[PDB]
Amino acid sequence: AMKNFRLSEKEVKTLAKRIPTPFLVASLDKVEENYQFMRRHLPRAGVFYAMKANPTPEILSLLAGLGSHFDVASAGEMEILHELGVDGSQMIYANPVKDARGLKAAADYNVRRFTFDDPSEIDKMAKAVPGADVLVRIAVRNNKALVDLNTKFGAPVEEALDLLKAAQDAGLHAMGICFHVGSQSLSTAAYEEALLVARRLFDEAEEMGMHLTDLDIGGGFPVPDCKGLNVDLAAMMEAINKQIDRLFPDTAVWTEPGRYMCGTAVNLVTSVIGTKTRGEQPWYILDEGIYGCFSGIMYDHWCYPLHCFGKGNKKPSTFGGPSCDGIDVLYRDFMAPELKIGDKVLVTEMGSYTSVSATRFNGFYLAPTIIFEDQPEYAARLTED
Amino acid sequence: MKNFRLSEKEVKTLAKRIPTPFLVASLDKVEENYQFMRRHLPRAGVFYAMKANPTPEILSLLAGLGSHFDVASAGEMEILHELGVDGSQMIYANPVKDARGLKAAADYNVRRFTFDDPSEIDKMAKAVPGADVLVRIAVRNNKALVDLNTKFGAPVEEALDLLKAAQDAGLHAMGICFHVGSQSLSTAAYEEALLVARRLFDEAEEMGMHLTDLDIGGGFPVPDCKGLNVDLAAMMEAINKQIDRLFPDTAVWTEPGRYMCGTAVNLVTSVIGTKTRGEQPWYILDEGIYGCFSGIMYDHWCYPLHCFGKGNKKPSTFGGPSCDGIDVLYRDFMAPELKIGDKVLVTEMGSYTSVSATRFNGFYLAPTIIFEDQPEYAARLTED
Numbered sequence: 001a002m003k004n005f006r007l008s009e010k011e012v013k014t015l016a017k018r019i020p021t022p023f024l025v026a027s028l029d030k031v032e033e034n035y036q037f038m039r040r041h042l043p044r045a046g047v048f049y050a051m052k053a054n055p056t057p058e059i060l061s062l063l064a065g066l067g068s069h070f071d072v073a074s075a076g077e078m079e080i081l082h083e084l085g086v087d088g089s090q091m092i093y094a095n096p097v098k099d100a101r102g103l104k105a106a107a108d109y110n111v112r113r114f115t116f117d118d119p120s121e122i123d124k125m126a127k128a129v130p131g132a133d134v135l136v137r138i139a140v141r142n143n144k145a146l147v148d149l150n151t152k153f154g155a156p157v158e159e160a161l162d163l164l165k166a167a168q169d170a171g172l173h174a175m176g177i178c179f180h181v182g183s184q185s186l187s188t189a190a191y192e193e194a195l196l197v198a199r200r201l202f203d204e205a206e207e208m209g210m211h212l213t214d215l216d217i218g219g220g221f222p223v224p225d226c227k228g229l230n231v232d233l234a235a236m237m238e239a240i241n242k243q244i245d246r247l248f249p250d251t252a253v254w255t256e257p258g259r260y261m262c263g264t265a266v267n268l269v270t271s272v273i274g275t276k277t278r279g280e281q282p283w284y285i286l287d288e289g290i291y292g293c294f295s296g297i298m299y300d301h302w303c304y305p306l307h308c309f310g311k312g313n314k315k316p317s318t319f320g321g322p323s324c325d326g327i328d329v330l331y332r333d334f335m336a337p338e339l340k341i342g343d344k345v346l347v348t349e350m351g352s353y354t355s356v357s358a359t360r361f362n363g364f365y366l367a368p369t370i371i372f373e374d375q376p377e378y379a380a381r382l383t384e385d
Numbered sequence: 386m387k388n389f390r391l392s393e394k395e396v397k398t399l400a401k402r403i404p405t406p407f408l409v410a411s412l413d414k415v416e417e418n419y420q421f422m423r424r425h426l427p428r429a430g431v432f433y434a435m436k437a438n439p440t441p442e443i444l445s446l447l448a449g450l451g452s453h454f455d456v457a458s459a460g461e462m463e464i465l466h467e468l469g470v471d472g473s474q475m476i477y478a479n480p481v482k483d484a485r486g487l488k489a490a491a492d493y494n495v496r497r498f499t500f501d502d503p504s505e506i507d508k509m510a511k512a513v514p515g516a517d518v519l520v521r522i523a524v525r526n527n528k529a530l531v532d533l534n535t536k537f538g539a540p541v542e543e544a545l546d547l548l549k550a551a552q553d554a555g556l557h558a559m560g561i562c563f564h565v566g567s568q569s570l571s572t573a574a575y576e577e578a579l580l581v582a583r584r585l586f587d588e589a590e591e592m593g594m595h596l597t598d599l600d601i602g603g604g605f606p607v608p609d610c611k612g613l614n615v616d617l618a619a620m621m622e623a624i625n626k627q628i629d630r631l632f633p634d635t636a637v638w639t640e641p642g643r644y645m646c647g648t649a650v651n652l653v654t655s656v657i658g659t660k661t662r663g664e665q666p667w668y669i670l671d672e673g674i675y676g677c678f679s680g681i682m683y684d685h686w687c688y689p690l691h692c693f694g695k696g697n698k699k700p701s702t703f704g705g706p707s708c709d710g711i712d713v714l715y716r717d718f719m720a721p722e723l724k725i726g727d728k729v730l731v732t733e734m735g736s737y738t739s740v741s742a743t744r745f746n747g748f749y750l751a752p753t754i755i756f757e758d759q760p761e762y763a764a765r766l767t768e769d
């Protein structure tokens with residue numbers, strides 16, 4: 001049902017005349033639409049936005065103003081939110097293994113909601129923020145996750161209540177259970193299964209006199225790649241919500257979406273800076289590559305949808321980035337029209353785990369994130385409606 | 386002669402004073418690396434490929450030693466400019482340039498370029514009319530870690546045509562360059578490339594196009610977790626001997642990156658968490674694959690890790706501090722029992738490491754501390 005944010009060819013042209021490539025263009029209205037869709041289809045799970053996916057300040061402010069909470073991974077992330085006026089009470093420090101700077105930032109900002117998955121974490125947490133609310137993260141199954149989040153993270157389920165009891169012994173507040181099924185999950189069942197497991201744990205805790213009040217179901221909601229998205233997100237979210245109503249009518253339930261919130265709200269605009277026409281497969285060199293926004297190729301095993309403009313015949317083509325490294329090859333055997341130096345191409349669904357792993361390799365600048373609603377092209381869309 | 390390596394004592398005293406993670410660079414080791422190259426490869430003047438490590442004190446050291454610089458972008462030119470390096474000292478050796486880079490080259494009077502395609506000629510001639518150009522040719526190497534000859538390099542049969550077209554656009558056809566690949570374990574690749582270049586210089590002479598300069602690129606290797614079987618002295622002497630034989634009347638240059646600093650930097654990082662439940666213990670470190678260990682991903686690399694202290698070792702896993710499952714750095718690594726707060730040391734970490742670090746998950750970039758500016762250095766000089 002929902003439309004992904006996509007710039008038109010005309011918009012690409014006018015934007016790139018004004019702004020030097022490469023740049024990202026983010027639609028706040030599409031971030032908002034994504035937040036509201038999750039509120040509509042998954043009403044039971046309050047949102048802690050996993051800003052690790054995309055920390056663009058205007059996005060964070062938008063989300064804060066919509067009532068979102070935030071999942072923070074580091075001191076840096078807390079500091080960003082603090083400078084935007086967000087109180088520590090709206091944060092969960094959900095990195096199960098915290099460092100000294102992070103714990104100090106948490107104390108400074110009155111962040112007192114933590115996750116953990118190991119006994120070695122308890123004394124660090126109890127010392128930095130005594131009496132903090134803690135959710136123990138359990139390791140869960142998922143046969144359809146792009147990124148496994150249950151080997152490096154997550155306690156065995158049979159240690160969960162023992163960990164909560166040890167944290168309680170150290171003066172922390174044993175508040176509940178969390179899990180993350182893994183990133184880019186194409187499984188709804190994984191959420192349903194984790195929910196049943198947590199239900200049994202909550203019941204066993206109650207008997208021990210520990211009363212658990214909060215359940216955090218993590219993120220993993222998927223976004224379309226160069227082959228679309230083979231999941232119906234509304235049905236996924238409704239099925240999760242149904243299982244939460246079924247099992248957890250009286251518990252405060254929460255979610256930590258990262259990828260989903262902005263993935264479909266951001267486009268990359270990049271120019272062809274060189275061609276190589278010799279031989280059978282042409283090459284085009286772009287001004288953005290694998291050490292910038294296309295770093296998700298490497299870290300996130302990802303294939304982004306590339307759009308070329310032009311109505312003539314297409315042939316298999318290679319696209320590379322602007323660095324001096326051989327690894328900087330983005331697409332091979334990609335059906336493309338004949339492009340020339342100065343042509344702009346468009347990459348859609350570029351909002352998540354892209355700019356956050358960009359670098360200044362070879363001294364290139366970080367591509368900036370342009371706010372679409374501040375540009376005359378947005379206004380032109382409003383008037384066209 | 387030997388790698389820069391902090392002792393355990395030095396690690397402990399540094400880490401009491403500087404929060405982990407941090408890199409420590411030895412300027413004296415960089416200088417020793419530069420001098421070693423001057424000694425064993427005297428015929429090739431150095432354009433330092435600062436893409437490997439652009440730490441400002443290193444660049445300033447190198448500039449003070451008389452090094453030139455290979456720049457890959459506007460940003461790199463800007464860094465050198467702020468350090469008072471003149472554009473005469475730079476080669477803009479990215480074969481495919483962008484608008485900002487060409488504008489910076491113009492502003493700073495950088496007038497030496499490489500290229501490998503006819504589509505690059507007009508860009509260069511517009512930006513810096515009359516610039517000196519070297520045409521980059523594609524060459525073979527079956528012992529390179531990183532292939533620098535598929536994305537880059539013109540076919541040899543196109544080279545002189547490219548120089549002539551450059552001439553037609555008013556650029557100065559100065560000569561030929563090549564890069565055999567990064568982490569080359571072959572000396573032959575260099576000797577064979579020199580031979581190809583020599584045939585082209587012979588042919589260009591017969592056409593009345595007299596070429597004056599040859600740039601042989603980089604690729605000199607650095608040790609990894611398994612060390613290094615290449616004798617660097619012998620590789621450099623072999624190359625130099627071929628330069629003397631085939632290019633006695635040509636100005637020859639080299640563009641080392643990795644070699645210059647790779648052996649001059651160490652990383653210090655703390656254990657921030659343990660996981661003992663397994664048959665195999667895990668240790669979580671405060672630096673990972675989204676920081677200086679990014680070379681695991683982009684550079685196919687394995688770094689030498691040193692753990693300290695005592696007792697029986699068992700196979701252990703080390704992960705980084707991110708929330709990502711991919712942030713696993715070593716598996717089945719024989720390590721002693723470590724605890725939260727213990728420091729570990731990674732050596733030979735100076736090249737293509739901090740340069741591909743990120744602020745993923747909001748972590749700060751690990752800073753580069755200059756060893757020579759630290760009491761630990763003075764203390765080594767007091768000993769001696």
Ligand SMILES: Cc1ncc(COP(=O)(O)O)c(C=O)c1O
Nearest residue numbers: 050183219220256257258259708
């Ligand atoms: C604790 C936590 N919350 C939220 C997220 C966001 O995940 P996704 O982008 O798959 O929704 C992650 C992903 O790494 C995570 O580790």
Ligand SMILES: Cc1ncc(COP(=O)(O)O)c(C=O)c1O
Nearest residue numbers: 324434567603604640641642643
């Ligand atoms: C143009 C150029 N010069 C020099 C180098 C340095 O290579 P190395 O670090 O292997 O010496 C590179 C590596 O990408 C390069 O592209």
Ligand code: NA
Nearest residue numbers: 157158159160
């Ligand atoms: Na159990």
Ligand code: NA
Nearest residue numbers: 199200201203
């Ligand atoms: Na039950």
Ligand code: NA
Nearest residue numbers: 291295357359
């Ligand atoms: Na990267």
Ligand code: NA
Nearest residue numbers: 675679741743
């Ligand atoms: Na990286």
